[PDB]
Design a protein around this ligand. Structure first.
Ligand SMILES: [Ca+2]
Ligand SMILES: [Ca+2]
Ligand SMILES: [Ca+2]
Ligand SMILES: [Ca+2]
Ligand SMILES: [Ca+2]
Ligand SMILES: [Ca+2]
Ligand SMILES: [Mg+2]
Ligand SMILES: [Mg+2]
Ligand code: NA
Ligand code: NA
Ligand code: NA
Ligand code: NA
Lengths: 510, 510
């Protein structure tokens, strides 16, 4: 269909003949420079390549206010997520309307020149409530208060280049490029599938069925910009998508990566997704159950209703100009060796099988079997490599402050003891001396599968520097992961406590 | 580099705004229509998409003569293979200069309108000698005399559409499209690999080494138009290329199919290939040993010298504008578990392993093991599926004219006997009654793995309708494949002769 607003705002194309000129200006000594943050880089790529058509810059207060309260740009164009350039006061103060500033990536690569229209301090309390529903635990609200700048700079953009990416050069198609890929294949009906997770057998099945019903080709369009905290890394996911696209009938599907920064904003995000896929050339779009939903908060309540997304999108159906295809999740029928829509089974007493996210996680943690009816083996293999089981995981044992036994001797005893076991894990007594440059390497060694023996705790104000995954405290305190009977417990008894704790937790298998 | 002659003659693009107009003219009742032959469709696709730049039509006698004797178009542009529209006298007679004719595909799809410049009867004796070296057994000479029309029609072309292909819509990139694929990846150095065969480990290794040495990305550019008689079908080959492109380091290679009709014209063809790859956007090209060579003739003499191609291309190096990369075929070193250039091994007593085409064919025929050091198992699997071993091959037993025993009873006895054996082969007593519509199905049943029992021979002037592969004559004549001791040999003795012949040839395994 036609881009949202009618014209694809591909600014790279629009400004092609101004590239040298804009680059020189961006590099002039007198121009103010703002280094884009990771989320701003995702957003600016989508504005610059027309993925956010009709947007041609970051929203000034006029459009922003209208999006916050009315889900529309000031001119009435449907638009549910505010895209703004958030900066701190020190920068906002040296800015005024008409000022032209250079926007860089990594303080080295000029990306665009922004012509300032306005500078404002938005009420982040109202934004959180009106756009993200108010729950302080909502990923977007957490970001909005703890990470985002307090000042928004509205303005028009002129393109120099899209944010630099060295991985997957072939798969990161812009809207113009994707439309040409579809055109060269004579594809005029394409149904897009959104995802920020690995794809299992059920997803392959549901997308092929969607294609069959809409008489459309398939576009697997995963998000590789920012997704939900804790999600599988995009490199692992892309490997999974590259593997699964090979399981579709030849010529039915195309894989392209979307550098979007999701807000995990449920229904409003679903509408935003529909618009973006339309800009990218899709004729149809699948809106999932709890689409773009961040789950439940700490008290167990849903941030969004499971069908809020499908209902909001349905309310705007007459002006979206992209067909939404009903979501028919499928499940496996052992006795029939096939998959069927969950809305069509049971009631007649029919056996079904499924593996939840929690169960999948468990199996990967213990190195357990994962059935081919659930996920293609080549996909499972990829997931195991990126998320190895306990016998292959790294860890750290921290000698707590309470210890009065020799820390040097206890560290040496632990190292010598661990070196007896087979397995191939690399071990090291690691002294950080409370230095950030050393503390930040702890998770790097753990991520490499190594076992670190840390002779002393770091100061509390350094905690934030060390991730807590697989880090265990050996101490007398009740908070200790491995509790000592006493501060001067004999070294040989301490060693045994540690070895048995590690075995009980799967790090050692005998 | 720049297209040959300086401008990409993409006629589809040039004539975009004349499509409706040309289509209507092509469909007018008064215009003369020529239905393109399979080779002409390969050639016209390359002219129309700019693959044959600077050509914009089929060569008139002026350019043709110059190509035949001087390897150049009349204006001096290097061009070694004549591309002409060959027709029969009946058609050539109703043609004259300035006449506009419609060129169709399958007598139904309008492809282009040709404005006639001239009509001529070339001396096919001189063409065969000057362009293809004169050997009546040269694939091109055989085609030139037995298939090609005796009259050539020179003229300029206006495009309606490229020849229709329903398979591999995604991989058949035109020169303009391929250049855009390279541009979107920022690839400015690309080395192209020509092939009309399956690719084994050695080819993957040689292309990656070429890429390393030329600091270029890899373009696997196989021919899928017309190749050498007897070659593996392009569907099987494309499956092999799709499988092997996955064995290159991520982001190093691109697969695109070339709808070229090779002439198997060695050195001249190698030069033509260099020009075509340049038109398609490649910066480098690999010229093989006996590149595009059809092998040896019946007397065992080479149609071309093994280095004639590399030498002819080297002679034109200063005007080709595409770098030719030296061909370094590799071989496997068992004791070192690696591949090395054959020009760098031995002399120092080094063990090497290789599997020739004859040996590979043998192994596929008997169902023998094919080592992973030679070819990736997934590739081997594809080749076995397309070329199944004897126990899975079809066949026909023809009851010869000499037989005086009951043909009905002997056919029934053979069928009942064959049905005892396991295996899954389907059997049928097949009466053709000398009808072409039935005779032409014999190889279709054999190709499906079936065993046919044919009660009588067809007339000699129908032989050409039935392929000879796996068709066996049971008769008293010395020419019989299964020789009868006498015309009235007892049915049970005949049955045993046939069963044992089939077992000896691998069709039955007990
Ligand atoms: Ca703040
Ligand atoms: Ca719920
Ligand atoms: Ca004590
Ligand atoms: Ca003739
Ligand atoms: Ca030779
Ligand atoms: Ca007799
Ligand atoms: Mg980018
Ligand atoms: Mg075609
Ligand atoms: Na820097
Ligand atoms: Na709700
Ligand atoms: Na017809
Ligand atoms: Na020679």
């Amino acid at each position: 269909p036609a881009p949202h607003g009618g014209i694809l705002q591909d600014l790279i194309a629009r400004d092609a003949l101004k590239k040298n000129e804009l680059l020189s200006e961006a590099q002039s000594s007198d121009i103010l420079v703002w280094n884009l943050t990771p989320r701003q880089l995702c957003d600016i790529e989508l504005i610059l390549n027309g993925g956010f058509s009709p947007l041609t810059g970051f929203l000034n207060e006029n459009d922003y206010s209208s999006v916050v309260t009315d889900s529309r740009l000031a001119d009435g164009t449907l638009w549910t997520i505010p895209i703004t350039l958030d900066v701190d006061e020190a920068f906002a103060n040296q800015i005024k309307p008409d000022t032209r500033i250079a926007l860089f990536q990594d303080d080295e690569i000029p990306i665009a020149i922004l012509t300032v229209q306005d500078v404002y301090k938005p009420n982040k309390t109202i934004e959180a409530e009106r756009v993200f529903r108010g729950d302080p635990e909502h990923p977007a609200i957490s970001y909005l208060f703890n990470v985002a700048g307090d000042y928004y700079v509205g303005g028009s953009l002129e393109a120099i280049q899209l944010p630099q990416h060295y991985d997957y050069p072939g798969l990161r198609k812009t809207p113009a490029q994707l439309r040409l890929e579809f055109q060269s294949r004579q594809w005029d009906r394409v149904v897009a599938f959104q995802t920020r997770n690995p794809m299992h057998r059920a997803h392959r099945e549901l997308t092929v069925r969607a294609a069959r019903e809409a008489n459309a080709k398939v576009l697997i369009h995963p998000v590789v910009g920012l997704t939900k905290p804790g999600d599988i890394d995009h490199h692992t996911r892309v490997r999974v998508y590259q593997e699964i696209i090979k399981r579709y009938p030849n010529g039915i599907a195309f894989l392209s990566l979307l550098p979007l920064a999701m807000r995990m904003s449920g229904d409003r995000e679903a509408v935003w997704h529909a618009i973006i896929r339309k800009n990218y050339g899709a004729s149809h779009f699948i809106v999932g159950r709890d689409h773009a939903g961040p789950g439940k908060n700490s008290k167990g309540v849903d941030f969004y209703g499971p069908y809020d997304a499908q209902e909001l999108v349905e309310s705007y159906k007459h002006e979206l100009d992209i067909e939404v295809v009903p979501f028919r999740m499928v499940t496996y029928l052992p006795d029939e060796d096939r998959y069927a829509p969950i809305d069509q089974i049971d009631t007649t007493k029919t056996r079904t099988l499924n593996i939840s996210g929690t169960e999948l996680r468990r199996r990967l943690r213990v190195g357990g079997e994962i059935p081919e009816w659930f996920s293609y083996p080549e996909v499972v293999k990829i997931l195991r490599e990126s998320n190895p089981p306990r016998p292959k995981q790294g860890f750290s044992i921290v000698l707590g402050n309470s210890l009065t036994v020799s820390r040097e001797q206890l560290s040496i005893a632990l190292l010598s003891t661990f070196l007896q076991f087979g397995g191939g894990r690399y071990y090291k007594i690691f002294e950080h001396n409370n230095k950030t440059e050393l503390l930040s390497l702890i998770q790097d060694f753990i991520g490499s599968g190594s076992g670190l023996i840390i002779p002393d705790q770091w100061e509390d104000d350094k905690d934030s520097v060390v991730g807590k995954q697989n880090v265990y405290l050996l101490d007398t305190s009740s908070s200790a992961d491995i509790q000592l009977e006493s501060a001067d417990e004999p070294i040989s008894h301490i060693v045994q406590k540690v070895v048995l704790f590690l075995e009980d937790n799967g790090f050692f298998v005998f």
